[PDB]
Design a protein around this ligand. Structure first.
Ligand SMILES: *[C@@H]1O[C@H](CO)[C@@H](O[C@@H]2O[C@H](CO)[C@@H](O)[C@H](O)[C@H]2NC(C)=O)[C@H](O)[C@H]1NC(C)=O
Ligand SMILES: *[C@@H]1O[C@H](CO)[C@@H](O[C@@H]2O[C@H](CO)[C@@H](O)[C@H](O)[C@H]2NC(C)=O)[C@H](O)[C@H]1NC(C)=O
Ligand SMILES: *[C@@H]1O[C@H](CO)[C@@H](O[C@@H]2O[C@H](CO)[C@@H](O)[C@H](O)[C@H]2NC(C)=O)[C@H](O)[C@H]1NC(C)=O
Ligand SMILES: *[C@@H]1O[C@H](CO)[C@@H](O[C@@H]2O[C@H](CO)[C@@H](O)[C@H](O)[C@H]2NC(C)=O)[C@H](O)[C@H]1NC(C)=O
Ligand SMILES: *[C@@H]1O[C@H](CO)[C@@H](O[C@@H]2O[C@H](CO)[C@@H](O)[C@H](O)[C@H]2NC(C)=O)[C@H](O)[C@H]1NC(C)=O
Ligand code: NAG
Ligand code: NAG
Ligand code: NAG
Lengths: 319, 73, 228
């Protein structure tokens, strides 16, 4: 399991610092481009948050669809292939995942800390991971090397053994024995996903970091920073413009700094992700679309194929 | 002339059913573009052409010819 | 070889136009330059901010005030400016880690792509990979990845195996194909059908196991020799 994109955030710095107040908002202009260079930082994040989801999931130029009649030789893919019944069209296993990953946002937009929507819907991501999977099944591994080429699936596993040094005469003789072992293996994933909350603990932390970083960024409004009171509207009602300058500029310089701390946290955290969205984009090319000769890159043991499955703000491979 | 998205209320762009490559991304799978007397349009992003790969258990497709393509990374 | 010469020499021909006619070609590198000139330019405009001081020109306050009061005013400029560098540096260290991550991916290719041949799919570019040509660029590097992409297709009926005497013949490398009459073995990624012989295939098991095996005759090179 890998994180891919992190929650796209955007801060309104004029509104967070001086809440809806004229006497204060004028003062924030002296500090100048601080406000305007944050949103240049939080935009550079939110742009590559689309680039990550772009590079990982869509490496394929066309969207393939699963052929209706399934003879794979006993391999039962119904689990990982899309289900038309659900209102959103997503494979059975993805649904087990979206249930794991999960006022609060009413007190975030009031201050400025908003959440932009991701470019690609959770629905569209499910159409890619249907194609990639539908290419891997039918077309072999060549659909990423060019136009897809259909191949009998049971003959594909005969190749993917010739990679790991098991001569293909082992497959066809064992095909039924492998069908049972494969179809049962996919059977165990369901329980390990559904019965264990720590399954997505990577992704659930990627979400619990932002909701932790934004929530803390709102509590920062409660700090005096040496000012006589933390409510911007008290000081203005309680003091003259001459003295409020001394008091307010202690709040601004404090709050405006509490964003530059938040942004600096994101840029770092968004580099942590941009490093994981490469490892996810590297697998997706070298693991799903190919066969990986790299030991323990695609998981313990000799590697045959991988099945991508979308997850909230992340991706889940079945190796 | 007010279109509704999943991202939010959009104003000033005619909705278009013709899904193209994403030009100006917006959010929740909507992309806007100036291509069309001209005006701004907005449409559901296209994922690329849909292609059914004909699959049958006895059949394989082996390429008879190739091309040498140079790509710049 | 000649057919590839034309296809290769023409491929390099197209790169020129795609480079010269499209400004977005280097858009990665041109942004790497446009970030610093954007970060430094902003770092100069920061000198125009009052930070709560009575005026933003350091030389005004000193001319306009005593040393006792200027301490109160100047230390508002310093603490502001000195902070506007710690913001700039923090931006660079992050941005220079973004690059140090890309200069590894460029150093990894240069070893595993140019100097070798990469078995890693879509690491060295879409399609099977042959070689890469590094080309310098300002504050960057530009690879020309020469890749092998199959083109024309033909539907072939195939079978995993062949019953000859009941021994199941499997291909050493390649698969069995049929144009509808004769069964041929051919290599996967290019169509070059050869006649099925005991030296194209190897023997394993029997015909009571394999699923999908088809009947045929497997030509034997030895039989016509001893028949001589
Ligand atoms: C693939 O496996 C699934 C479940 O492992 C099969 O679906 C089940 O089919 C039985 C009937 O034999 C029903 O009683 C169950 O309710 C079904 N379960 C689910 C989750 O749908 C499916 O038939 C198998 N397909 C193939 C081709 O073997
Ligand atoms: C290889 O191992 C598999 C299981 O790992 C064996 O298949 C099992 O055989 C026993 C009979 O002794 C059955 O009770 C199980 O149901 C089988 N499992 C499956 C998944 O089919 C198989 O027999 C072993 N083969 C050899 C040659 O030892
Ligand atoms: C393989 O494809 C190449 C082109 O992709 C073919 O070469 C072309 O052949 C036509 C004749 O029909 C000429 O007009 C072109 O000038 C050729 N192109 C080049 C670059 O030489 C080649 O004939 C094909 N080979 C097979 C066996 O189909
Ligand atoms: C399938 O390919 C085989 C081999 O090329 C064809 O058999 C040959 O056909 C040619 C005429 O097309 C004859 O001159 C040869 O004598 C045949 N070979 C033998 C060993 O008899 C066959 O005709 C092809 N069939 C189809 C449907 O394409
Ligand atoms: C390929 O030929 C073999 C014989 O060379 C066929 O084997 C026959 O199978 C049936 C069904 O079990 C038996 O009743 C016959 O006795 C077998 N023939 C012999 C000579 O033993 C085989 O069926 C053929 N392939 C297919 C797909 O039918
Ligand atoms: C899109 O097409 C449907 C039917 O194809 C039509 O009912 C609908 O009005 C179209 N959308 C717009 C914005 O015209
Ligand atoms: C192979 O058969 C399928 C069956 O529908 C067809 O769509 C495809 O075009 C055929 N291949 C070629 C090269 O025409
Ligand atoms: C291929 O599928 C057909 C049904 O379309 C079936 O009759 C045949 O036995 C299958 N062959 C193999 C080898 O799976």
């Amino acid at each position: 399991i890998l994180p891919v994109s992190m929650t796209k955030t955007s801060v309104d710095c004029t509104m967070y610092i001086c809440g809806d107040s004229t006497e204060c908002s004028n003062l924030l202009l002296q500090y100048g481009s601080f406000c305007t260079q944050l949103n240049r930082a939080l935009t550079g994040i939110a742009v590559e948050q689309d680039k990550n989801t772009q590079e990982v999931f869509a490496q394929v130029k066309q969207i393939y669809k699963t052929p209706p009649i399934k003879d794979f030789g006993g391999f039962n893919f119904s689990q990982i292939l899309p289900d038309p019944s659900k209102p959103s069209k997503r494979s059975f296993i993805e649904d087990l995942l979206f249930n794991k990953v999960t006022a609060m946002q009413m007190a975030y937009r009031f201050n400025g800390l908003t959440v932009l929507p991701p470019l690609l819907t959770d629905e569209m991501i499910a159409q890619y991971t249907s194609a990639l999977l539908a290419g891997t099944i039918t077309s072999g591994w060549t659909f990423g090397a060019g136009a897809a080429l259909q191949i009998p699936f049971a003959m594909q596993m005969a190749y993917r053994f010739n990679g790991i040094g098991v001569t293909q005469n082992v497959l066809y003789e064992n095909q039924k024995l492998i069908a049972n072992q494969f179809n049962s293996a996919i059977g165990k994933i369901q329980d390990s996903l559904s019965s264990t909350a720590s399954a997505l603990g990577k992704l659930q932390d990627v979400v619990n970091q932002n909701a932790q970083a934004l929530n803390t960024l709102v509590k920062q409004l409660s700090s005096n920073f040496g000012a006589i009171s933390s409510v911007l509207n008290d000081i203005l009602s309680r003091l003259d413009p001459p003295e409020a300058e001394v008091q307010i500029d202690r709040l601004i310089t404090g709050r405006l700094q509490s964003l530059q701390t938040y942004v600096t946290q994101q840029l770092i955290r968004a580099a942590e992700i941009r490093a994981s969205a490469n490892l996810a984009a590297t697998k997706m090319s070298e693991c799903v679309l190919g066969q990986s000769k790299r030991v323990d890159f695609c998981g313990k043991g000799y590697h045959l194929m991988s099945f991508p499955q979308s997850a909230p703000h992340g991706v889940v491979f079945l190796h | 002339n007010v279109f509704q998205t999943r991202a939010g209320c959009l104003i000033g762009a005619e909705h278009v059913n013709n899904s193209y490559e994403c030009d100006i991304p917006i959010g929740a799978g909507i992309c806007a573009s100036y291509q069309t007397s001209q005006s701004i349009i907005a449409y559901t992003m296209s994922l690329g052409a849909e292609n059914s790969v004909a699959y049958s258990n006895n059949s394989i497709a082996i390429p008879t010819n190739f091309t040498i393509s140079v790509t710049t990374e | 070889q000649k057919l590839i010469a034309n296809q290769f020499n023409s491929a390099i021909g197209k790169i020129q136009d795609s480079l010269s006619s499209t400004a977005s070609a280097l858009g990665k590198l041109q942004d790497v330059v446009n970030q610093n000139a954007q970060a430094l330019n902003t770092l100069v405009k920061q000198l125009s901010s009052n930070f709560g001081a009575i005026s933003s020109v350091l030389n005004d306050i000193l001319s306009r005030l005593d040393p006792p009061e200027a301490e109160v005013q100047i230390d508002r400029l310093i603490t502001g400016r000195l902070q506007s560098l710690q913001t700039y540096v923090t931006q660079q260290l992050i941005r220079a880690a973004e690059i140090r991550a890309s200069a590894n991916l460029a150093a990894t290719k240069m070893s595993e792509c140019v100097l070798g041949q990469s078995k890693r799919v879509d690491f060295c570019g879409k399609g099977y990979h042959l070689m890469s040509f590094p080309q310098s660029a300002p504050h960057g590097v530009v690879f020309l990845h020469v890749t092998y992409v199959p083109a024309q297709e033909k539907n072939f009926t195939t079978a995993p195996a062949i019953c000859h005497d009941g021994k199941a013949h499997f291909p050493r490398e390649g698969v069995f194909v049929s144009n509808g009459t004769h069964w041929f073995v051919t290599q996967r990624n290019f169509y070059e059908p050869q006649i099925i012989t005991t030296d194209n295939t190897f023997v394993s098991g029997n015909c009571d196991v394999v699923i999908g095996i088809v009947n045929n005759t497997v030509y034997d090179p030895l039989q016509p020799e001893l028949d001589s």
